[PDB]
Symmetry: C3
């Protein structure tokens, strides 16, 4: 019995090298999209990987409510490209980069995720500081990071250029109307610095490698189809939907800030609704539109709103004041005398205590049925032409606290991507059906295999180890016409009298193509056919 | 100096294959245990792994309090078996499957763990919907998943059958007496679908492999011994205890629902006790049994309960009402005039405010010594024959809110498996002592080595990589009689006047046997001797 | 096309061995530092790894406030050494051991991290039990654990000695002045037990290996320099700063106990300040020093404190009482009529309700600007000679609740190591500059590469797999004088009128040297040159 020794190893002497952390400042150029270019030319840098982008956010002064989106560093990136003299080596969109890093909690934390950055801070005077200057770090994960020095990008005596395109500053900022965003936008400038790990290698022996480069296709607005052409060697395919808020002003009622659970979203929304829902006043409350229906709460504390009973009990109400309930705070309906969507009927029990000192109701326990979709409705959709009612019956004070939100990486139709609006998915390679499903079993598989919490519907064709094998791909057959991937979905049917029915959707299809990387005459890549 | 190249690899071309996600519907057969069978016969399916079971839970309508246990998908599974024409290939119990997946947070989340499923929802009218229809996904982790395609189950032109046995629906449901469980049970049916990843391989070269199959032995009620016979090649051995609630009605006072921390359990329990503990009333409170001792709280706010001082201060008590304290809410004792277990004496400070509108006391800060064992006591044990007192002096209203809980995967004597009731463990291989310990150092080691939070006392005999080596086992010596593993424990001594002393216990011993998998004449396994 | 089989393996038969868990009691010897020695001499133990130290903490009785620091098991360890007959094989400081385990959440949990151990418990009578006896487990991670049996420490027929030096018990205890620490210290004794996994190997074939041993250098108080000499083969270098609280009594105002988030620290601090900040009294509040400035809150609820407006609104104040605000609770300043640091001016809105029953103010919402540095100020620094004011104007009651905290593993100048006090870092190998940076990009890299949340500024020179290659090092050139590593930093500039400016700092430099491990004539190590 010849036995393999599992208590000792014969240590290999590795290639002689020395690593170094290297920072570079960029050249910035500019609706004038901001672009940073970083030039890497150094004869003693043989390979590199682990790119990190530094961004200095400035001091924010003035009046209004201002905050940064979570993961602001990732969300300010529109596009990243690595090139040489022979053309582009590897590139990615900001959405797909953020997708690839969504499971790296450390990287997400470094890119800007804290109370200081992401709470909605309030400025009271034109000289009040709303945010202090800060620095975020964006880990640009590339295929050259999977196996450390084995997968690194070798600079075969070539000059490597890294180009970063930035999103407009309105994408990364949550603000109210009181904040002077025009001035802020005129003054804001991205200040980037690029870091990487370089390797000074002694007598490097270079071999050709393989690289996967994502390619992204967005369908037209509300179409259930998208197609990616010229597919010859794909390792994976993923499909998801994005909301198109272009038909709105991008104003929402609430945003939970640094708290990012579904419960947190719902709590912020309910908190914003309670100030206009239950009113303690001397006589009929004033300052609400004519369409508002404010009723007094009887001695039994129960108000009926057409099949719905709301239980209101407030402590310490003065003897000259009564408790009032808003029975149609937000209303939606497409036909005049049919079903109505009423945000007031989603409450069952409201208790609290009136404060004589601050003249407010401090709410204690609330029983309600608000979900994430309601927190995700845009304010424009409550008052669209299709609504036969006056949708928004809130006070002017609460109307003034709505927030502009322009986050570019939102999936689905809600902030959490919690509702699945795809009820059937079909993929075709050429004309034949490659995959079909009704439930999200492919998303279950993507999450199980990548150990992620925010998976998408994904067909993965590669199950081999990463760089020590050539990746397994679905291969084209141009003779039989199998050279394109077509995706058709069936959207989940929503009620025509729910405002979320009118959020516009786009289908996104991402394809990972296989490329050969060769190192004769500098660095170059060729698409595998 | 010959140096190993650590900056380049020679990529191997792997076996030509194509993966595919495959779903199957089953054949259901039926105290009529429900059994689902899934048949896999497909000539182009060469291998498979990554089994996922889909379960559609129906709409739940009616009155009462209803909820699902956490991880309902895992808890509805009694047994899973994979077979071919030559017999069983691999099988497992539901408890051990859940044990093997306890460290996979993604899988646990997919099997049904959310507020919507696990809050105890309340139905008010016979047409109220308590739960909406939902789908859960149970990842059935098999030994064929450890190394992706290397460890996959090859179908040597054989038909593979997957059989799932389900637990009764009462195991996965938390309910009160007001819910119509008889009708619910008559109507509930499991609707399962089986998914796996199949591989269509071109010219597969098959080699024999090794597989570990768990074998489970449960000792008799309250015996400190269990033995597993016919042990010839075990890779690991684990020991834990389970509570036997068969001598009870399985009713408990509280359950925290979706919150699953120890603090959450304790908070739910204290919340259920406070409504009968402190009473604001006009005169001596009514509606309590004769054995209740309700005393008025003096001006200093301190009530003495035999060496115990409770500090009660309630704000806003009306002038016609007084504050009362329940001094023997739950009581236990075995001898008439000796030590008594009194749930009231476990409180030291109770403060709150009376609400005139809702006629309740809203409690603020509470100081207490309630632990997890108290939340884990069954209501039947408070009123057993051995209790010389009337144990339960609660109001009928609170008595009506007790929950039936029949969770099948509970370990220890509390819901969290927090108390260790094993004070000494001894394992014998044959007649010789193989292992001995007093503290839980083997559980510490199991958690450290498996990177788990819910480890058990485990002897692992294998420290070699998984599939690239033959596993290391403890080998039998039938000549010397070393062919069985005997386990004897010494239980921690509990006080005879604590009700948890009378919870019945079973010892569970799990043994992982090594099997050879061969592929001539289809798939077959043979026990290593 | 020769294809590598990725669906089958040729299983290797490994070395024949049998593992066993082994516990040992020690020999304890003793300002009399406690030292435990464990002797391992057993002919059938061929290798070992995975050391775990058991510690029994006793019952704590008496009066006062008492608690254990988080991770008490790690914090009681001063030094660990593994030796043979040829000298020390491997050793480490307690700080660096805890650093190496900071990312192992399971190990941190096992070493003592729970509400029961880490809440500040209160003893009321001299016989009250503050803490029950408990056992913690400290995983002593060694280089012999990285690759299981491949990296294990082989005992070439040698006797191995493990020696543990313990910190004084005052390092692991958080206490007030009311606790009798002199008696506690006279009675406390460490009771340790050592566990490891031993391997009984049949015909072991031993080969020489490599090991990295940390070496630690602490700079002098407040010097921005430190140097590690005799550096010939280092795999990594890390730099951080520690606070020196020797010029204080180590008393702080608050400690959050088991809650260990920055928000938790701030909340505990604000809670301790509110009792003296806002006072509901009949007339000017009494019991405060003469330097206190207590003003009555006007009808509009706004008090001005030199450019700062505090909004105070308390409900249910009796008609004979008024609301008062402490305008200089904690004050600091170095010049008589210049800038002042006033803890009262860091509040903007204070609301709450007075309780007539308990005669206290129960605070509801608070708006403030307290940060982690304020919670990290020592009480001695408020009343130093450099303060031209009476710094601490709190009541005697709150002064009596300050806690002694002597935690030995604190980094930076705050409890969370959140503020970076290093604005520039330079490393020199010999006289040449090896590395330079202004921001913490090296800490970003350390966290990204080690997947940690508490990284330090680190230069790592090794990117090769751990034990199957010889590690890559930065190599000395004694001819050119490159045989020492010098570190110089520039500290962040703090305001001279902030008390945190006067916390003393030490620079810590840790170097990982490469050693050869050989097994002829027992175990021995030699420093690589």
């Amino acid at each position: 019995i010849k036995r393999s020794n599992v208590f000792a190893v014969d240590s290999q002497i590795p290639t002689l090298y020395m690593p170094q952390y290297i920072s570079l400042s960029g050249v910035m150029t500019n609706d004038n999209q901001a672009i940073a270019s970083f030039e890497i030319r150094d004869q003693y840098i043989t390979a590199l990987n682990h790119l990190v982008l530094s961004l200095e956010l400035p001091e924010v002064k003035g009046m209004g409510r201002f905050g940064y989106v979570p993961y602001v560093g990732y969300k300010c990136i529109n596009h990243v490209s690595i090139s040489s003299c022979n053309g582009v080596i590897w590139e990615i969109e900001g959405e797909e980069l953020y997708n690839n890093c969504i499971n790296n909690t450390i990287a997400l934390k470094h890119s800007g995720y804290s109370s200081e950055l992401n709470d909605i801070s309030i400025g009271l005077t034109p000289n009040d500081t709303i945010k202090e200057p800060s620095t975020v770090y964006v880990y640009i994960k590339t295929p050259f990071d999977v196996e450390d020095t084995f997968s690194s990008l070798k600079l075969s005596d070539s000059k490597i250029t890294v180009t970063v395109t930035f999103n407009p500053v309105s994408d990364i900022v949550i603000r109210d109307s009181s904040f002077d965003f025009e001035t802020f936008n005129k003054e804001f400038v991205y200040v980037p610095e690029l870091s990487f790990i370089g390797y000074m290698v002694k007598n490097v022996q270079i071999k050709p490698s393989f690289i996967e480069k994502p390619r992204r296709v967005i369908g037209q607005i509300n179409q259930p189809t998208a197609t990616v052409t010229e597919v010859h060697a794909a390792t994976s395919l993923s499909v998801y939907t994005k909301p198109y808020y272009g038909n709105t002003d991008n104003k929402f009622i609430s945003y939970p800030g640094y708290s990012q659970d579904e419960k947190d979203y719902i709590d912020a929304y309910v908190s914003r609704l309670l100030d206009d829902l239950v009113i303690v006043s001397d006589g009929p409350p004033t300052g609400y539109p004519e369409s508002a229906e404010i009723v007094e709460v009887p001695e039994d504390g129960i108000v009926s709103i057409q099949d719905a009973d709301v239980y209101v009990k407030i402590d310490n109400v003065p003897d000259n004041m009564s408790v009032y309930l808003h029975t149609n705070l937000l209303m939606f309906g497409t036909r005049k005398n049919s079903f109505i969507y009423n945000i007031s009927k989603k409450f069952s029990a409201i208790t609290g205590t009136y404060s004589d000192a601050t003249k407010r109701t401090i709410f204690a326990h609330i029983s309600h049925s608000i979900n994430i979709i309601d927190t995700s409705i845009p304010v424009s959709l409550w008052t669209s032409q299709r609504n036969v009612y006056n949708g928004d019956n809130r006070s002017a004070e609460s109307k003034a606290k709505d927030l502009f939100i322009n986050d570019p990486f939102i999936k689905g139709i809600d902030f959490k991507n919690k509702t699945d609006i795809i009820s059937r998915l079909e993929v075709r390679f050429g004309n034949d059906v490659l995959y079909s499903e009704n439930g999200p079993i492919s998303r279950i598989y993507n999450e199980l295999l990548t150990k992620s919490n925010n998976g998408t519907r994904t067909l993965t064709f590669n199950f081999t180890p990463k760089i020590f094998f050539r990746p397994t791909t679905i291969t084209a057959n141009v003779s039989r016409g199998k050279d394109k991937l077509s995706v058709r979905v069936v959207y989940s049917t929503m009620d025509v009298n729910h405002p979320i029915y009118y959020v516009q959707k786009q289908l996104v299809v991402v394809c990972n193509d296989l490329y050969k990387v060769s190192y004769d005459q500098g660095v170059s890549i060729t698409k595998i056919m």
